[model samples]
Target: SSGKKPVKVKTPAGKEAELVPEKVWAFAPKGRKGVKIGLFKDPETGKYFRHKLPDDYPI
Candidate 1:
C-alpha cells in the first residue's frame, strides 16, 4: 500500500523534501484556541520535527 498526503520537512542533506507524517494533532492553550500541529519522521534519516498546520487543514 501507499502512504497518505505528504508534508514538507528538512533533511540531513540540507534540503527540503515532502514526506508522510506519522501523526496529526493540536495543542490547546489555556485561554485561546491552539493551532493544528503535525509530527513527521524521516524514513531514511529518522529525524523528528514539528510543523504548524493551517486552521482549516484536516488532521
Candidate 2:
C-alpha cells in the first residue's frame, strides 16, 4: 500500500519507536529465500544502521 514501511525499532531502556527505513534489501540464506533488512538513518547522529526484518516481507 505504501512505498515505505514502518519498522519497530527498540532502543535501550525502552526508548523505542517505529521508524521508516531509508533503504530496504533482501538477505538470502541457504534456502534462496530469506528475510529483509532495513537501513535506518539516525537523525541524531546522522548515522546509518541496519535491523532485522521478517521473512517473506516485501522489500
Candidate 3:
C-alpha cells in the first residue's frame, strides 16, 4: 500500500501513456498510496496529466 511504484500516467481526456522516470515534466500522488497512484504532467499541452482512468479506459 505504500511501496508501489509509478508505472504510468493518465491524461485529462481518457488516455494512458507509459512514464519514464526522467522524462516526465513533473509528478505527484493523490493519496498516501505512494507511487501506486502516482501522477505526472507533460511539458507539452494537450498531453498527459495526473488523474485516475475511467472505468471504460482501455487496458
Candidate 4:
C-alpha cells in the first residue's frame, strides 16, 4: 500500500530520485529485554511493519 507523500531528493551519486516517506520503530537495550527490533511503517498511513518480541521479557 502507498504510504508517504512524494518527495524529490538527490542522491550522493548526484542522481535525482523520488523519496517516499517511511516510519521507523527501534527496540534497543533501553526497551524491555536484551532483544532489539526495528521496523518501518508508513508516515501518512498507520500501516506498520511487525516483528516478534522475545518471550523472555519479564511481564
Best by lDDT: 1
TM-score of 3: 0.28
Off by over 4 Å in 4: 1-3, 23-59
RMSD of each: 3.7, 3.5, 9.1, 11.7
Candidate 4 lDDT: 0.39
Clashes of 1: 0
Q: How close to the true structure is residue 18 of candidate 3, measured as C-alpha lDDT? A: 60
Candidate 3 RMSD computed on C-alpha atoms after optimal superposition onto the true structure:
9.1
TM-score of 1: 0.63
C-alpha TM-scores of all predictions: 0.63, 0.67, 0.28, 0.29
lDDT of 3: 0.41
Instruction: List model 4 lDDT by residue over 1-55, tens digit each.
Output: 3225433444444445454434223355664644423233433453544333233
Q: Estimate, for each residue in 1-59, the C-alpha lDDT of model 2 and write its tens digit.
A: 12276778763334577778777887787878666788876665666777776665477
lDDT of each: 0.70, 0.68, 0.41, 0.39
- List, residue by residue over 1-59, the lDDT tens digit for candidate 1: 22367766676556788877677876798998988777777667777767765676566
